C-alpha cells in the first residue's frame, strides 16, 4: 500500500445503496463513480476474524485511493469518506467471503 504485503482483488459491480435520507441518496447517485471498485488487502491467512480483515482492507484501500485521487487534484469531503467507508466495507466483506471459501 506503499510499503508491502497487499494484494488487489478483481473489480466488482457497484451496489445499489440506500443511505436512509433523500440528500445522501441523491449525493450517492451523483458521486458514486468517484469511489473504488476494487480493494487492496493482506492475505486472509493473516487475520483472526473476518472483522479485522474487513477493518484493514477498508483503511488501506481508502487511504491508497485517497493518494491516487488527491495527486489528480480533487478532494474528498467527510461525506465522501463516510459513504466510502460503508461501500468499501461491503466490498471488503464480499472479498473476504470469496477468498476464504478457497476450498
UniProtKB/Swiss-Prot annotation:
Intracellular or extracellular location(s): Cell membrane; Golgi apparatus
Glycosylation sites per record: 59, 75
Substitution effect: residue 61 to A: Accumulates intracellularly
Region ranges (PrP27-30 (protease resistant core)): 1-103
Disulfide-bonded cysteines: 57-92
Pathology noted in the entry: Found in high quantity in the brain of humans and animals infected with degenerative neurological diseases such as kuru, Creutzfeldt-Jakob disease (CJD), Gerstmann-Straussler syndrome (GSS), scrapie, bovine spongiform encephalopathy (BSE), transmissible mink encephalopathy (TME), etc.
Free-text note regarding domains: The normal, monomeric form has a mainly alpha-helical structure. The disease-associated, protease-resistant form forms amyloid fibrils containing a cross-beta spine, formed by a steric zipper of superposed beta-strands. Disease mutations may favor intermolecular contacts via short beta strands, and may thereby trigger oligomerization.
Role of this protein: Its primary physiological function is unclear. May play a role in neuronal development and synaptic plasticity. May be required for neuronal myelin sheath maintenance. May promote myelin homeostasis through acting as an agonist for ADGRG6 receptor. May play a role in iron uptake and iron homeostasis. Soluble oligomers are toxic to cultured neuroblastoma cells and induce apoptosis (in vitro). Association with GPC1 (via its heparan sulfate chains) targets PRNP to lipid rafts. Also provides Cu(2+) or Zn(2+) for the ascorbate-mediated GPC1 deaminase degradation of its heparan sulfate side chains.
Family affiliation: Belongs to the prion family.
Oligomeric and partner information: Monomer and homodimer. Has a tendency to aggregate into amyloid fibrils containing a cross-beta spine, formed by a steric zipper of superposed beta-strands. Soluble oligomers may represent an intermediate stage on the path to fibril formation. Copper binding may promote oligomerization. Interacts with GRB2, APP, ERI3/PRNPIP and SYN1. Mislocalized cytosolically exposed PrP interacts with MGRN1; this interaction alters MGRN1 subcellular location and causes lysosomal enlargement. Interacts with APP. Interacts with KIAA1191. Interacts with ADGRG6.
Protein name, entry field: Major prion protein
Portion of the parent chain present: 123 to 225 of 254
Amino acid at each position: 500500500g506503499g510499503l508491502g504485503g497487499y494484494m488487489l482483488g478483481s473489480a466488482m459491480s457497484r451496489p445499489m445503496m440506500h443511505f436512509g435520507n433523500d440528500w445522501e441518496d441523491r449525493y450517492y447517485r451523483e458521486n458514486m463513480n468517484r469511489y473504488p471498485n476494487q480493494v487492496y488487502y493482506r492475505p486472509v491467512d493473516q487475520y483472526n476474524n473476518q472483522n479485522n480483515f474487513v477493518h484493514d482492507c477498508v483503511n488501506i484501500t481508502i487511504k491508497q485511493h485517497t493518494v491516487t485521487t488527491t495527486t489528480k487534484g480533487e478532494n474528498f469531503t467527510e461525506t465522501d469518506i463516510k459513504i466510502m467507508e460503508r461501500v468499501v466495507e461491503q466490498m471488503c466483506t464480499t472479498q473476504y467471503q470469496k477468498e476464504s471459501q478457497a476450498y
